[PDB]
């Protein structure tokens, strides 16, 4: 049903996202348990990690488009990624290594993310009707890898330790590279321009040098979040000013500002919602016992099942507004479960968390998936970079919002933690509901501006 290179890109992307979500699923628990961070420290450190993971994407798009070529940069990204996972496994012997290992993952991610997508676009004649189908199968590829990693990584880490989980992340990347190399021949005539000239060693060294510098800068920022704050503040004012110098820019700007709120909410899944599942939810569903950290897999689960249904099924600004309302309902549901449907011992049914992740995933499908493809088309390299930047700033903010649910290490009673999660989720739901209302109010105006 698809070109032969499509399956290749599908499985490369699957295994890379597997490696990334293996870390994401266990990283906050790892900070707290393995490194002895407080919950506040782990949450803000995770926010800075995620911020760098997503604000660097633009570097990798540039390196693929203009310096080394899409396919070369896929290979180099997968190698830096694999090295980062094995360094993280090695952090258990050498704890001082931890922040360098994470910086290496972030930079590797910055290099890799833009390029398989970029490659896949070039697998199809420009108006091939399969394209939309292809890119939905791309999102599902991402979400299958995510679904497997978020499911298994916590179990693995519990039974075999973190070093093994992180080495298996590395190995996921190794086999991503193996399947790329084995199928190299399928993308012979596919690539960006530097893919078809011999490789410039000048530029390759500039890219390596700049990568290593960035690894050290990321490690520093992750260790000193209190200045990552100022750095991303100065950058945001700077990027916005250049954007204004360059009215359909206003439309992308407002939809980006609303996306930021979405990303604050998405950043709770590995942090506050993770610890809410650990602390105040029954760890048994349909009669099976589970690792509560595996609950994060409910987000890719719901995307994998919903995205076929929601491909077959106003326009853009309404779509963003709907997404905002669903996210609001997800947090309002979480608060309600805590306020009214908990046990005498302070625990809630995992079915409430299933419903929370359903709402949050539908929000995701209406904003972050749809938003990328069509906001870009409506607007170009600069706007993707600024979107990635506002996403990074959103993730830092998300870590700081997560800090309000943080639980001291000595509390053992769920009836003490439930009201903290319930107050914070309720307030997040109510602010996101207001945000969705103002969004709706601006839908007609902004939809005139699209004309």
């Amino acid at each position: 049903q698809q070109p032969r290179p499509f399956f290749m890109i599908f499985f490369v992307e699957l295994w890379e996202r597997f490696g990334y979500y293996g870390v994401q699923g266990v990283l906050a628990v790892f900070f707290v348990k393995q490194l002895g961070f407080s919950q506040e420290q782990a949450f803000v450190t995770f926010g800075a990690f995620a911020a760098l993971v997503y604000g660097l994407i633009s570097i990798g798009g540039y390196v693929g488009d203009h310096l080394l070529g899409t396919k070369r940069t896929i290979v180099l990204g997968a190698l830096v990624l694999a090295i980062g996972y094995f360094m993280t496994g090695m952090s258990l012997l050498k704890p001082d290594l931890i922040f360098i290992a994470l910086g290496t993952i972030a930079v590797g991610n910055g290099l890799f993310k833009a390029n398989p997508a970029s490659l896949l676009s070039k697998c199809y004649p420009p108006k091939d009707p399969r394209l939309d189908g292809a890119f939905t199968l791309f999102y599902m590829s991402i979400n299958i890898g995510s679904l497997i990693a978020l499911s298994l990584a916590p179990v693995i880490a519990d039974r075999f330790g973190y070093s093994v989980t992180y080495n298996l992340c590395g190995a996921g990347l190794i086999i991503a590279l193996l399947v790329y190399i084995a199928c190299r021949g399928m993308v012979k005539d596919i690539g960006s321009e530097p893919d078809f000239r011999p490789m410039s060693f000048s530029k390759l060294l500039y890219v390596l040098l700049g990568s290593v510098v960035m690894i050290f800068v990321c490690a520093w920022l992750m260790h000193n979040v209190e200045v990552a704050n100022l750095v991303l503040i100065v950058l945001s004012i700077v990027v916005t000013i250049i954007f204004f110098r360059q009215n359909k820019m206003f439309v992308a700007f407002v939809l980006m500002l609303e996306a930021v709120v979405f990303y604050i909410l998405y950043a709770q899944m590995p942090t506050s919602l993770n610890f809410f599942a650990i602390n105040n939810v029954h760890h048994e569903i349909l009669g099976f016992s589970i690792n509560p950290v595996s609950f994060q897999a409910l987000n890719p689960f719901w995307v994998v099942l919903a995205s076929p249904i929601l491909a077959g099924i106003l326009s853009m600004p309404m779509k963003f507004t709907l997404g905002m309302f669903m996210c609001s309902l997800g947090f309002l549901t979480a608060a309600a479960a805590g306020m009214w449907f908990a046990d005498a011992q302070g625990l809630t049914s995992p079915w409430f968390i299933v419903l929370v992740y359903l709402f949050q995933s539908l929000g995701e499908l209406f904003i972050s998936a749809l938003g990328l493809a069509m906001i870009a088309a409506l607007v170009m390299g600069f706007i993707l970079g600024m979107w990635f930047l506002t996403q990074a700033a959103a993730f830092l903010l998300g870590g700081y919002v997560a800090t309000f649910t943080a639980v001291p290490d000595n509390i053992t009673d769920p009836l003490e933690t439930l009201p903290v999660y319930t107050n914070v989720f309720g307030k997040i739901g109510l602010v996101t509901l207001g945000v969705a209302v103002v969004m709706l109010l601006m839908v007609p105006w902004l939809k005139r501006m699209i004309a």
Epitope: D158, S289, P292, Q345, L347, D409, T412
Partner: nanobody, 122 residues
């Protein structure tokens, strides 16, 4: 995933016993371990526990007599019971729940030992 309790037995009023809970597969380090006890014709009740980061919870009637502790190297959890009284007589079970909480009821815990009998004689 499966816990084993040891150390029970028979002791005279005001003496001491030491239960130990050990796990097999997973590292017990990620788990709050709660000790429950069932006396003849009564419900399982929470006695004492330690979470995954050294926070402690106790039933009122055992404070200042029982101590829960954890050897994270041997991956083992202990219940030292001093000043044992006849009404401490029960089957004692250890239970494991992932994370930092010690809920008071048995439904909060998925992993369970078989139990060891503790008898305190007047």
């Amino acid at each position: 995933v499966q816990l084993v309790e040891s150390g029970g037995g028979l002791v005279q009023a005001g003496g001491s016993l030491r239960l130990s809970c050990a796990a097999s597969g997973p590292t017990l380090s990620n788990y709050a371990v709660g000790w429950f006890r069932q006396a003849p014709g009564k419900e399982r009740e929470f006695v004492a526990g330690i979470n995954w980061s050294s926070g402690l919870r106790y039933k009122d009637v055992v404070k200042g007599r029982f101590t829960v502790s954890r050897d994270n190297v041997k991956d083992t959890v202990y219940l030292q019971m001093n000043s044992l009284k006849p009404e401490d007589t029960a089957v004692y079970y250890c239970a494991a729940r992932f994370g930092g909480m010690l809920p008071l009821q048995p439904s909060g815990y998925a992993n369970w030992g078989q139990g060891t009998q503790v008898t305190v004689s007047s």
